[PDB]
């Protein structure tokens, strides 16, 4: 099975197209770098999954999607998802958010903004070990963003003060575990170069 085919059979078309658009923004070709396309797809999916799990009411109280059902009109998502927007627009969303909350605009483009903590978030996904990648991304980012790191081997690196709960962590990690297993069944795994 081609990685191209793996991608088609394992991700939503919406995810795939955004991933291709990102590679277009980066002038890279999906056909020539399927590992990169896969990586972008997984990253996108993680960001959306994280952002659909928490809501905040007007008073700042935190709800899960289930707990909040019937009240959603009166809730707003806890995280703004910046990843997956066209990049040119994303930069301006980031700036707008920073300005609205009286905080510094980060130098680099974030993946999420946490309305509760008023922090930008960078999400990382590794085939290696989460803490190693945390330290690497720290060199670039400093304290400019919260890092949320997940790995395909149930490893992760999250702030003690992250808004993501056990259930949400579990949901991200299970999907990654599931992808690793599916990749392996097609012998696409030990081929893979990940985000690290």
């Amino acid at each position: 099975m081609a990685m191209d085919t793996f991608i088609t059979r394992n991700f939503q078309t919406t995810i795939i197209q955004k991933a291709k658009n990102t590679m277009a923004e980066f002038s890279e070709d999906p056909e020539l770098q399927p590992a990169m396309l896969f990586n972008i797809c997984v990253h996108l999916e993680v960001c959306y999954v994280i952002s659909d799990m928490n809501f905040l009411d007007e008073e700042g109280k935190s709800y899960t999607a289930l707990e909040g059902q019937g009240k959603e009109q009166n809730l707003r998502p806890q995280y703004e998802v910046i990843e997956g927007m066209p990049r040119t627009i994303a930069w301006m969303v980031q700036r707008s958010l920073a300005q609205e909350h009286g905080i510094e605009t980060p130098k680099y483009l974030a993946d999420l903004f946490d309305y509760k903590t008023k922090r930008f978030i960078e999400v990382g996904i590794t085939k290696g070990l989460a803490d190693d990648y945390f330290w690497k991304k720290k060199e670039k980012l400093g304290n400019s963003m919260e890092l949320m790191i997940f790995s395909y081997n149930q490893d992760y690196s999250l702030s003690n003060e992250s808004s993501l709960d056990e259930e949400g962590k579990g949901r991200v990690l299970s999907r990654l575990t599931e992808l690793q297993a599916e990749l392996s069944l097609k012998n696409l795994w030990q081929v893979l170069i990940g985000e690290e």
């Binding site: 939503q12 919406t14 995810i15 999916e45 960001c47 959306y48 999954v49 952002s51 659909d52 998502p77 703004e80 998802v81 997956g84 927007m85 627009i89 301006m92 969303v93 707008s96 999907r175």
Partner: peptide, 19 residues
């Protein structure tokens, strides 16, 4: 999982157009 994506894409459009 698809709902997470569908909803996320809606929210992004909502945000951008409110700016």
């Amino acid at each position: 999982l698809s709902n997470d994506i569908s909803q996320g894409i809606k929210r992004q459009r909502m945000t951008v157009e409110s700016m």
